[PDB]
Amino acid sequence: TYMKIADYGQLGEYTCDAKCDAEFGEPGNIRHLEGKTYDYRGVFCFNRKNLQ
Amino acid sequence: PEKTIVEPIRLKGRRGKIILSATPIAGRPVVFYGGGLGSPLELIPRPGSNVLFFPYGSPDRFQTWGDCHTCDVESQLMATYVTGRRC
Questions:
Q1: Are A44 and B72 an interchain contact pair (Cβ–Cβ within 8 Å)?
Q2: B68 vs A44: CB contact, 8 Å cut-off?
Q3: Side-chain half-sphere of B71: how many Cα atoms within 13 Å?
Q4: Please, are residues B60 and B35 in contact by the beta-carbon 8 Å criterion?
Q5: Rounded-to-integer distance, Cα B64 and Cα B73, Å
Q6: Which terminus of chain B is more solvent-facing, meaning fewer CB atoms within 10 Å of its CB: N or C?
């Protein structure tokens, strides 16, 4: 499992002057993905007479 | 008369003596197939008898190493000819 940053998002605008205030903007986003591991198998046989 | 026979052969001997149970006619090539042989092969019999010598030099060997549906045992070797007389 691993993290990912979807987007940083915008934080803070070009506010005017003489304005005792500020703006909260818009926070980013962090997702948390994950993944498996798959197996691969097989089988094979002989007759032990021609093998000998 | 003029019967035709397809029959399996069970090899016998270190020189490869094949005994047929019906004495092929006279000069028609009796044909051996299966048994790992890549292609059917023909041989002339001796007139009146039913003993053949398998050529030690084998033409092909279509082996099938590794298989779990039949344990690649073998396909058995057959032989095909015609017997009896004409008239």
A1: no
A2: yes
A3: 7
A4: no
A5: 9
A6: C
